[PDB]
Design a protein around this ligand. Structure first.
Ligand SMILES: O=C(O)c1c[nH]c(=O)[nH]c1=O
Ligand SMILES: O=C(O)c1c[nH]c(=O)[nH]c1=O
Ligand SMILES: [Zn+2]
Ligand SMILES: [Zn+2]
Lengths: 365, 367
């Protein structure tokens, strides 16, 4: 009519929440009886508030409220029907399986990935998913997980964070992981979580709620990780790698020109032959191996994203169920698309769903 | 008509001579392998130690005469079609000095910039720097001295403030004094991000990550902190020029706004009233953006954020000389931005005229 597809939309299955509920170290879910909803505590930047609340009963509630929407497949479908979304490509949210002990991670990752497949089977044609990987485990266990996700119905990709195997995404030990995913034609969805070292937010950090780590930390983290991939030659070494970047590439469309200029003016790089004239620029990679979600909350940002990658490589997302009304968050981004490319346009239909349908083969199984 | 460059730096010969004698970053050091090395950044410390210890690569960047020579500045202007420069000390300014030595050198160096501008009246104005490692009293004394300095049109400062960043309440009297004196504040990065974010392969990428990412991100965090702390509301006459088209601010402005209005704690504790001045409003009323963005993509975003009347052309001379071209010829790191202006707003348009210099002339009262 045409189809609306949401590619940035999360869940924590009940089995995953139940795990978080039993933890005493981040990530965790903890009930504070002065609030009905349990608190979801995921982030390094939240540790200070957690500790303050664990000592002083007068301190503010740490983390964010855990609504039922995080774990309810039924509320996901309700959200879709209420918002005119025909298909969601759901993904486990941060920090995935990153925090698990090496020995246990593969069994848990594999169980949870299968639960996602089973969730999609309940609503055939309306749900597909990005699987996540046991990246704290040895690479051979990670490969075994990739081999399993390749066989799972409704799986169309992999969601992962910026830590890789623990040394980031420019780690050559991670290359076989990108390679095995790309060879299986799975889209890689890169998503933030670790943000930036907390000291950058300053000694008044606790006064600003979650604004700085979420509004700045997250997209900057994404940008740094993809820039490191680019500099390390990951996009040339895995030529068929295709990546979807969270939050319109973080800040990448805005900084792409600056990155190119710093590269071609880097004396050391140039003098040591690391800037050959046939180098694939960041602009070329943005056109050939990167897709951007449209979760940017303004036509200013969206226009830059579109100018960087083309309208055929932008994909609508909501980031449901984060940022509930205190869903404006879904609608603002839909409006941003229209302002950017005009209502009823082929570009609008592309961004709102047809790109995702094409790239992620949102029919088969 | 007039081309004005508001993002263009010098280290006076006095400043370099000090750097040549220094034991720790920042410093200038000669190496037998080649031109002195300029070593400024924390990201350069590992390379410095390894070079002090044979065939390790040259640390820092080549210290050409372009950093120190007024004649070279004018020549660069005359080979790049620039009529007027508003020059500034380069990072890290007076930041690294002991609190005791900083006032004396800060003021001597500000006086030298005024002297330099007097050599080329009408073509040179400057942003002054402040002894922010010293007590506030000395910072205020320096402000009072720069207020009376001929050809001074503003202050350049980093993100560290007095040592606790720009949301530091003790810094509010400094912003008030500068804003009352009608001095534009040119916010410029230096400290980047903590080096661990660049990872253990950091060394293989030359300076690309600290400069291409760390700098504009540092700027963005500093201004966001100022904004969140109410600085712009508390000092309503404060005007700020942001380096590198605001770092990443025009791209993240929407995200920042969304995160604020959806922040449960902030909203429920009354920190997000309905009449709050948004970042979009501050971007149109108290913020100017330079056009040092190297692409019409980023430039168009900056223009949509602050308006074409609040964008100002700059080059960042002399930091990115051509590597395989004549440094005495036109610089591509300056031609790129000029072209970005053309692509974004059209050659010969009044918007081009505004961005290329007329905005700077108006806002900074140049003649
Ligand atoms: O903005 C987002 O995408 C998110 C923000 N904060 C989270 O904890 N998870 C997310 O997915
Ligand atoms: O990009 C820049 O503006 C700069 C980059 N690197 C420096 O050392 N100083 C600068 O001013
Ligand atoms: Zn998300
Ligand atoms: Zn500069």
């Amino acid at each position: 009519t045409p189809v609306v597809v949401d590619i940035h939309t999360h869940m924590y299955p009940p089995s995953y929440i139940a795990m978080l509920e039993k933890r005493q170290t981040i990530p965790l879910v903890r009930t504070f009886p002065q609030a009905d909803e349990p608190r979801l505590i995921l982030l390094s930047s939240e540790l200070a508030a957690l500790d303050a609340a664990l000592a002083d009963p007068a301190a503010k509630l740490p983390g964010r409220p855990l609504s039922t929407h995080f774990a309810s497949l039924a509320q996901k479908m309700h959200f879709m029907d209420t918002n005119g979304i025909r298909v969601s490509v759901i993904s486990l949210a941060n920090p995935w399986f990153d925090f698990l002990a090496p020995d246990e991670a593969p069994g848990i990752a594999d169980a949870v990935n299968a639960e996602f497949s089973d969730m999609c089977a309940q609503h055939v044609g309306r749900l597909f998913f990005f699987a996540a990987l046991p990246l704290s485990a040895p690479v051979d266990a990670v490969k075994a997980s990739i081999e399993r996700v390749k066989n799972l119905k409704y799986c169309r990709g992999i969601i992962l964070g910026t830590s890789g195997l623990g040394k980031g995404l420019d780690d050559p030990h991670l290359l076989p992981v990108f390679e095995a995913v790309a060879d299986a034609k799975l889209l890689v969805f890169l998503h933030p979580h670790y943000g930036l070292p907390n000291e950058v937010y300053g000694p008044r950090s606790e006064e600003y709620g979650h604004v700085l780590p979420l509004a700045l930390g997250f997209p900057m983290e994404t940008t740094i990780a993809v820039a490191r991939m680019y500099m390390a030659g990951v996009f040339d070494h895995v030529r068929n790698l295709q990546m979807l970047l969270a939050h319109s590439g973080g800040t990448l469309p805005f900084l792409a020109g600056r990155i190119e200029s710093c590269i071609v003016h880097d004396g050391h790089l140039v003098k040591t032959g690391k800037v050959p004239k046939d180098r694939r620029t960041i602009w070329t990679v943005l056109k050939e191996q990167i897709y951007l979600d449209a979760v940017i909350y303004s036509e200013v940002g969206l226009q830059a994203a579109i100018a960087s990658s083309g309208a055929d490589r932008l994909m609508f997302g909501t980031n449901h169920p984060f940022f509930p009304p205190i869903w404006d968050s879904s609608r603002l981004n839909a409006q941003a698309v229209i302002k950017a490319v005009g209502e009823g346009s082929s570009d609008a239909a592309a961004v709102m769903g047809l790109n995702a349908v094409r790239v992620l083969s949102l029919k088969a199984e």
